[PDB]
């Protein structure tokens, strides 16, 4: 390379009462090469050289205080935890950070559709030990019990997708952290905001379908179990045409029930 | 004599989005977007160099107020809005580079 700069004598607006200036220039000299300076005046010569490394390091414009703590992700608005897969704090980031999205909130469904008592989909605010269960009114009285099979099946699936969504697994992850123009940055944030909006929709569509299925499966399991011994009493209830003690309902809900035992007894009450 | 089949419910649930629904109430949900911050940069695990009253170019050229920055290293240099120069007036044609 070669850099020729001509000194320009002329007064410029006074800065710290100086009408003069110094224009700074730089030159990188490669291991083989030689630095050659020719000057007949006005040169601001070097005193030596600087070490010039690859990358990884950076600069940030921020007025946020530095504090004694450990956080992997830095933004000009202070450090942020990298739990969640996305963030809305700042498009400027230094560590292993969540991606920047326009959205300030993306709610990931981690449950089932809310259909409450107050206004088969019989939403019970009273069932808090499981996502799906049974309510009976027999000879002995009333009672409620949750089905832990359908519940654990729903929990396990939400656990699976949740972990995959928030990293915390062993991989090359689903939403890999960003490391790190205007137009390019806006193009990026629009495509990433689209991704986040679609992913959450897809994920939640699956979770609703998931939980709706588990409920339908448990109702049909009961239907195939009771068979002719009961009738689909409109809503989410069945009408068992015999008497069942707290042990008979237990046998239905715990799966150890058969139509042959209560066969003739059910055939009697039905034809009346 | 009457066996009912239901599910869990909450008085007020969280409204979410699916493929067929833009507003759908669910029992439980979680956040996927970090909106909040303490308002402070953490020292660990990165080397932070607080420029203070100095700009990186001022620390590079060697402005007296920036003598403390000599031969210093960093993972991230933190440049302050209130930083100023206090040596010979200068201009860097192609400063950002």
């Amino acid at each position, epitope marked *: 390379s070669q850099q020729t700069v001509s000194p320009n004598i002329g007064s410029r607006p006074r800065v710290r009462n100086i009408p003069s200036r110094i224009s700074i220039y730089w030159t990188i000299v490669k291991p083989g090469d030689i630095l050659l300076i020719n000057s007949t005046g006005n040169l601001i010569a070097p005193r030596g050289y600087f070490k010039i490394r690859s990358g990884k390091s950076s600069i940030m414009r921020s007025d946020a205080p530095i504090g004694k703590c450990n956080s992997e992700c830095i933004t000009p608005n202070g450090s942020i935890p990298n739990d969640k897969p996305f963030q809305n704090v700042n498009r400027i980031t230094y560590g292993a950070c969540p991606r920047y999205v326009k959205q300030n909130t993306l709610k990931l469904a981690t449950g089932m559709r809310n259909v409450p008592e107050k206004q088969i989909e019989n939403g019970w605010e009273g069932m808090v*030990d499981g996502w799906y269960g049974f309510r009976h009114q027999n000879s002995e009285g009333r009672g409620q019990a949750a089905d832990l099979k359908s519940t*654990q099946a729903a*929990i*396990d699936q939400i*656990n699976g997708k949740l972990n995959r969504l928030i990293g*915390k697994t062993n991989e090359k992850f689903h939403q890999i952290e960003k490391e790190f123009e205007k137009y390019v940055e806006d193009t990026k944030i629009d495509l990433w905001s689209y991704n986040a909006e679609l992913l959450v929709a897809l994920e939640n569509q699956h979770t609703i379908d998931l939980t709706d299925s588990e409920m339908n499966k448990l109702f049909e399991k009961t239907k195939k179990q009771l068979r002719e011994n009961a009738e689909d009493m409109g809503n989410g209830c069945f009408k068992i045409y015999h008497k069942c003690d707290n042990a008979c309902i237990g046998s239905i809900r715990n799966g150890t029930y058969d139509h042959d035992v209560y066969r003739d007894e059910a055939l009697n009450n039905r034809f009346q | 004599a009457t066996l009912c089949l239901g599910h869990h419910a909450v008085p007020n649930g969280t409204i979410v989005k699916t493929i067929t629904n833009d507003q759908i109430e669910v029992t*439980n949900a979680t956040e996927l977007v970090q909106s909040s911050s303490t308002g402070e940069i953490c020292d660990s695990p990165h080397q932070i160099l607080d420029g203070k009253n100095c700009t990186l170019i001022d620390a590079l050229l060697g402005d007296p107020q920036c003598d403390g920055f000599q031969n210093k290293k960093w993972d991230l240099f933190v440049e302050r809005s209130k930083a100023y120069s206090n040596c010979y007036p200068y201009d860097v044609p192609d400063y950002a580079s």
Partner: antibody
Amino acid sequence: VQLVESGGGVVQPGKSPRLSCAASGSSYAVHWVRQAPGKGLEWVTLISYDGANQYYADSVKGRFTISRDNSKNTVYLQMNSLRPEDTAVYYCAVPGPVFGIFPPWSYFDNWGQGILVTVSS
Amino acid sequence: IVLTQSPATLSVSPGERATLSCRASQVISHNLAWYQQKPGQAPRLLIYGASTRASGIPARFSGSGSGTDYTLTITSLQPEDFAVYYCQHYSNWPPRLTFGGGTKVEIKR
């Protein structure tokens, strides 16, 4: 939601000591996790929120009994058919919620102070 | 299902990072919880659902894993973190509850 335990001290095999775990005013399910001296944690039993279901480990199956008096807001670990392998610090625990629901089998977000029993004669 | 914790003891100096492993005999679908037990007192819940950190627990405790291989990380270990740690499995349909052997986070000297 502090938990308080009682019924410790030294006990001679043949006796049937009763371990009590009281609350602070509704009701969840209650588990019992024991720790032998110098050894690690071992899950022994649990009782449902209502009491309909009770689960015991193979170690204490047929020897230990779990009951609950909602009226007194307590759970009772009735331990009979003693073995000197029951010398442990007994901790009662409350299962934590998962995705809004509180099923009996889970992590423990609430623990009792710990009560030591000594099967020795 | 059986939980195997490694190492039985881990020698760490303050400032350093600790990596506590929990191996399950078969897939536990992230139903794991981590506890800190100081001498004399009851175990303290740190993480649940393998990755979810308990209310008020310092940010340095990081729970991860999948399949049968799970991990507990303490990014910048404080002198108050030297204790015994136990991983815990739990399940409602196949009813199960197991605790690992435990690992001692000992002061490196």
